[PDB]
RNA sequence: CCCGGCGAGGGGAGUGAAAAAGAACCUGAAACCGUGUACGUACAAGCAGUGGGAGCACGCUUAGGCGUGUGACUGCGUACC
RNA sequence: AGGACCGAACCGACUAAUGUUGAAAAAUUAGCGGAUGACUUGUGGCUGGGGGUGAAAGGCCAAUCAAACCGGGAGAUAGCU
RNA sequence: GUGAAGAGGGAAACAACCCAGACCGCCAGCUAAGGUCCCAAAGUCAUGGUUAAGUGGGAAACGCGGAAGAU
RNA sequence: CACAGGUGGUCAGGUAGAGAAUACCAAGGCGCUUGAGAGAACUCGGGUGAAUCCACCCGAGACUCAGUGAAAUUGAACUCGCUGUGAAGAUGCAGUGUACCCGCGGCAAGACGGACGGCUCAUCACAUCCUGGGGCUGAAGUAGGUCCCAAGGGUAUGGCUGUUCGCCAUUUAAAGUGGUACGCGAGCUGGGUUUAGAACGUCGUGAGACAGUUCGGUCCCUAUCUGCCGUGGGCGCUGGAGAACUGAGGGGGGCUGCUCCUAGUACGAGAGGACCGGAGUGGACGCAUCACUGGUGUUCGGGUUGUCAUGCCAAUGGCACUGCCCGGUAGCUAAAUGCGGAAGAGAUAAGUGCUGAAAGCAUCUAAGCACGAAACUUGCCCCGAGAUGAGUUCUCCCUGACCCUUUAAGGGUCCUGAAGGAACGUUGAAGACGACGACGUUGAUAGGCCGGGUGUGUAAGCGCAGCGAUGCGUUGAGCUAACCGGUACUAAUGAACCGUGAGGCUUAACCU
């Protein structure tokens, strides 16, 4: 349906009642507010633009400030797009919480791999080329716990990238 | 490697690097002013500021540690008596770097001195 | 005399017919290295030339369509002993 | 007393690598071998080119040997590019 | 007979295949082999025939089949 | 060559040392010929300063490795793929397709780079081999021959023949068959020939050669472009600029063993015996991480042998591989795993099918008309409008003046200098160099500091006991680089350059 954008903070382990250790990743998911709505009539397809975080007004470029003021929302750190599933349509300025993933139990995480120096053929394939600064998508991941008041989301296993990176969580298409 | 790493490559023997750091720290504490490249000035500041902060408190253990890390009786004698009280009320930032113009494209140079350097 | 570093080197004035003769010193072309003049080239495939061919600045019969440098395109085009 | 043993200097290139217009027109590095004996070295001299020398690889004779350099035969040469 | 010692046009290319022996120049017209949908200059010309498989646009012997060909 | 190579004798100290060996010291000699620059004349725009005569530095053009500078080669290069011809794989001949121009880092499909022979894991077919896993061969065993993701390009003995060798015999883990110049004689070598010396003699006017003789022997060079991967400078998408996406096209992988019941059901006289692929459970490989399971972590602590020093001890610093070990911060890895190679869909060979003949039968098809193999494409992860066919969406900015001509996609001057970028500093989980994220006084970007965390282990001093060593309370102490949240204590100041000033021509619809 629609995915949110969060920030990686760290990763640790979680202990269950039965006494089982499961790796988890600390992801802070700020409430993403819709800024622009693209429709078939005008834009040619259905989509919603989501912004997260905040930036100092000094560094915000005037075109970006005007675009944000058009939607009447605070300027964030970036913009992301998600393709709708022909479901309910949102409106500009509609804040989106993390409750959507509270009843899915299956999500996919997309991130950016950490940069690395040139790697040999054996290191990469076991062809030389640039390592890092590339996409990484991991699917079939189940959310462990969801905290609405804390905006903290936990997923089994590790996630791509290092601390401070920006990741995207989407509903698990595979089923 | 390449991730959350502190300190430049500085290709050389570790003992030689430590000796150079000690020599530059001694020169700075003696003359209170040096001219050197920006990486070298930053390394000197990083290696000397802990010593100055430790010297703020006057004690036998602190003096012995300063002597061990400097190997100069005169330098330690100078310390704990003038620099300490001078920067007693200042927490951090005991050294300043001033750009003295130029190489520009080969290796930069700058002056590293104390906050006051006099009085 | 000035710049330059109180050097080297350069720019003036003077001598010198001439310094487009300055001790690297008569006359001074090429292969090679830079700048300026006009043009082609960032959607365009092969011995790179040959004819056609719109323009770009200038001088001409002071237009009446000529020449000084270029060809985007186009038919042909497997160097020499 | 050891053509004795380990082990420095020293001697041999026996093995591997460094380069094949090289650092050198054959040298360098790392091991191996001898290290009181058929040992090595400083200096002086003799054995001379169809020849000398050669514990026989026809090895070496001025960074070259199945016969070295210089000037003359020779501006040589049958065949050939 | 050609090349050897002959240019040029056609066979998509090519030296032995077909026409064809270039004194030079001219923005002229007519032929040979070969073509007249385009690429590329010329009739999408006229009549009588075979062709449903692109055989044309690659094939022996043999009872339309035989028929499998090269990044 | 001031070379890195070679040069005969004497002076021969201390410590732990049997030693002129080993490690540091006495007197003495050195820190090495690449590691590192000034402001480089001049020229432009600026701000600052006593009101002509100007003085200071920035942002630039003008040097750059603080640099002389050689190297085999070179007919001229604007140096693409496939198909066909060709003294025979055509960058150059004919047909077709693709690609913005110029650079940088790696991998060689291959340039016929340049001056016979086999030793060949990377793209190939036979079991290829710089030392992963396998399937079959009534294989008596080992072993050959047949096949996969694949090219040990350093190596046996031999018949046909010349040896490693082109067919193969014994082959073991291969002694091996050609494509690519058998990837390189820009690797090696001769092991037989035309070629290192002998060598019977030859075809052969001769050259040229005899994959014929028995043994054979010394074979040279510092990536030129080109194909692929990644990454840069310029330009264009038509006023400029900042962001976010659709998408023509392109990239790589779809492996495989067991069990639960379903069900000892169907079918089947009995024996026999699934479809079930419903769920879980292993291995090879890909992404990502360090909390867990091992290493490194020459930047952190502790122990210890010799030696020099701090005037001596206690205690430290320098050297002996990081002098030798116990560990170990962060980071980097696997010896650890969360996921992946789906499920499903389309069209499929064979096969399985609803009604149904021509030709009162039959039949997968003639009329209406449906599934389906690990094959193909979507579906899974993507980049991508340099796709010049140059896209879509949102946002920000310029609203001046005058003169001249060859009077129009015209030219010139003063002023303005927008959004955006670059210029410089801090810098990073980005990095060879480019490039990219965040901050620059409207601030945690870097250094240090505060408290915590990890690591290491009981630091020194003090008084007591032991007439030595050593222990006791001080003390779970001292130290801690890269970890966590703040702190402006210090460094990123006021700024300056490019980038504009209403945006070309033709046409259809709105009030003029």
Residue numbers in the entry:
A (entry chain D): 1 to 126, 161 to 209
B (entry chain N): 1 to 102, 104 to 120
Q: What's the publication's text?
A:
The proline-rich antimicrobial designer peptide Api137 inhibits protein expression in bacteria by binding simultaneously to the ribosomal polypeptide exit tunnel and the release factor (RF), depleting the cellular RF pool and leading to ribosomal arrest at stop codons. High-resolution structures obtained by cryogenic electron microscopy demonstrate that a large proportion of pre-50S states are missing up to five proteins (uL22, bL32, uL29, bL23, and uL16) and have misfolded helices in 23S rRNA domain IV.
Comparisons revealed that states 3 (C_(L22)-), 4 (C_(L22)- ~ H61), and 12 (C-CP_L2/L28) were most abundant in the Api137 dataset. In contrast to most other precursors, H63 of domain IV was not docked in its terminal position. Tentative modeling revealed a non-canonical turn within the root of domain IV, causing H61 to thread through the gap created by the absence of both uL22 and bL32. As a result, the entire domain IV is positioned on the solvent side (back) of the subunit, preventing the docking of the respective helices in their correct positions, which renders this particle a potential dead-end state. Additional misorientation of domain IV regions was observed in nearly half of these cases, resulting in an overall frequency of 18.1% for the ~H61 states. While certain states exhibit similarities to previously characterized intermediates, surprisingly, nearly half of these precursors lack the early assembly protein uL22. This deficiency induces precursors not observed before, including a 180° misaligned helix (H61) within the 50S subunit, as a result of Api137-mediated assembly inhibition.
